[PDB]
Enzyme design. Structure first.
Site, PDB file in Angstrom:
ATOM      1  NE  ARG A  45       5.072 -10.984   8.013  1.00  0.00           N
ATOM      2  CZ  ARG A  45       5.817 -11.825   7.481  1.00  0.00           C
ATOM      3  NH1 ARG A  45       5.792 -11.325   6.281  1.00  0.00           N
ATOM      4  NH2 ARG A  45       7.022 -12.177   8.341  1.00  0.00           N
TER       5      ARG A  45
ATOM      6  NE  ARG B 103      16.836  -9.899   3.710  1.00  0.00           N
ATOM      7  CZ  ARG B 103      16.331  -8.812   3.322  1.00  0.00           C
ATOM      8  NH1 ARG B 103      15.771  -8.611   3.089  1.00  0.00           N
ATOM      9  NH2 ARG B 103      17.606  -8.335   3.123  1.00  0.00           N
TER      10      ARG B 103
ATOM     11  CE  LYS C 245      -0.926  -0.425   4.905  1.00  0.00           C
ATOM     12  NZ  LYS C 245       0.879   0.123   5.922  1.00  0.00           N
TER      13      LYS C 245
ATOM     14  NE  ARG D 255      12.344  -9.676  -0.729  1.00  0.00           N
ATOM     15  CZ  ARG D 255      11.029  -9.347  -0.055  1.00  0.00           C
ATOM     16  NH1 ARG D 255      10.952  -9.188   1.686  1.00  0.00           N
ATOM     17  NH2 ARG D 255      10.159  -8.185   0.087  1.00  0.00           N
TER      18      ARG D 255
ATOM     19  NE  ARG E 121      -2.335  -1.536  14.695  1.00  0.00           N
ATOM     20  CZ  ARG E 121      -1.998  -0.510  14.900  1.00  0.00           C
ATOM     21  NH1 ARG E 121      -1.693   0.308  13.453  1.00  0.00           N
ATOM     22  NH2 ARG E 121      -1.493   0.156  16.112  1.00  0.00           N
TER      23      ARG E 121
HETATM   24 CL   LIG Z   1       3.383  -3.737   2.344  1.00  0.00          CL
END
Ligand SMILES: [Cl-]
Ligand SMILES: [Cl-]
Ligand code: NA
Ligand code: NA
Ligand code: NA
Length: 214
Positions: free
Chosen positions: A167, A156, A13, A123, A88
């Site tokens: 998440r 990572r 975003k 990634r 949130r």
């Molecule tokens: Cl983001």
């Protein structure tokens, strides 16, 4: 112009934040920025926030709302503000209403979970320098190797697929009722709500936002 900009972690975003800031002449504010800056000022809110964080404690909704109210009273929010990633939860949105903090638009920056996963798990990184490659979007020149040093690329722990998916699961369980909350606020005429398709090219999203906002 008062805007809330919501979106899932990894959806991107932030790619539209500068366009919004430059369209309206408004700053980008966030509770994270308020919390990390609270110490810098000498306000008692900031000292109270400092002690909470120094004790590893959760920042209560009452304190965060106080910080938001404090932040938007500053001179740079006279044209409005871009509130990034807050509220949130529904209890936080109600605390905004209790405090009298209404906004003109709620923008939900929507990217499907599978695309976020693909963006992150593809990634590949050169940890010593922080250089980042992506198997599809930006591959290394030599397979598996850092362009600069020739050292073999790694990944990572925070970008593991199971970690990203956990998440996003947690995000949607918290945010689905909040989205419905703002859609209901919009039906009541208290604000405007729009679901923004963030999978389009950035320039097309920018155009879309121009149509949504005016
Ligand atoms: Cl983001
Ligand atoms: Cl090179
Ligand atoms: Na700032
Ligand atoms: Na959704
Ligand atoms: Na898998």
């Amino acid at each position: 112009m008062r805007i809330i900009l919501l979106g899932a972690p990894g959806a991107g975003k932030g790619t539209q934040a500068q366009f919004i800031m430059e369209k309206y002449g408004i700053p980008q504010i966030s509770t994270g920025d308020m919390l990390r800056a609270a110490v810098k000022s000498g306000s008692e809110l900031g000292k109270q926030a400092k002690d909470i964080m120094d004790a590893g404690k959760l920042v209560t909704d009452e304190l965060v709302i106080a910080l938001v109210k404090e932040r938007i009273a500053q001179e740079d929010c006279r044209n409005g503000f871009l509130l990034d990633g807050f509220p949130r939860t529904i209890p936080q949105a109600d605390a905004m209403k209790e405090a009298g903090i209404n906004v003109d638009y709620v923008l939900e920056f929507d990217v499907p979970d599978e695309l976020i996963v693909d963006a992150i798990v593809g990634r590949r990184v050169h940890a010593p320098s922080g250089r980042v490659y992506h198997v599809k979007f930006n591959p290394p020149k030599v397979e598996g190797k850092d362009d600069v040093t020739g050292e073999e690329l790694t990944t990572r722990k925070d970008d593991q697929e199971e970690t990203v998916r956990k998440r996003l699961v947690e995000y949607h369980q918290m945010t689905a009722p909040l989205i419905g909350y703002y859609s209901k606020e919009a039906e009541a005429g208290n604000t405007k709500y729009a679901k923004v398709d963030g999978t389009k090219p950035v320039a097309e999203v920018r155009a879309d936002l121009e149509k949504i906002l005016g």
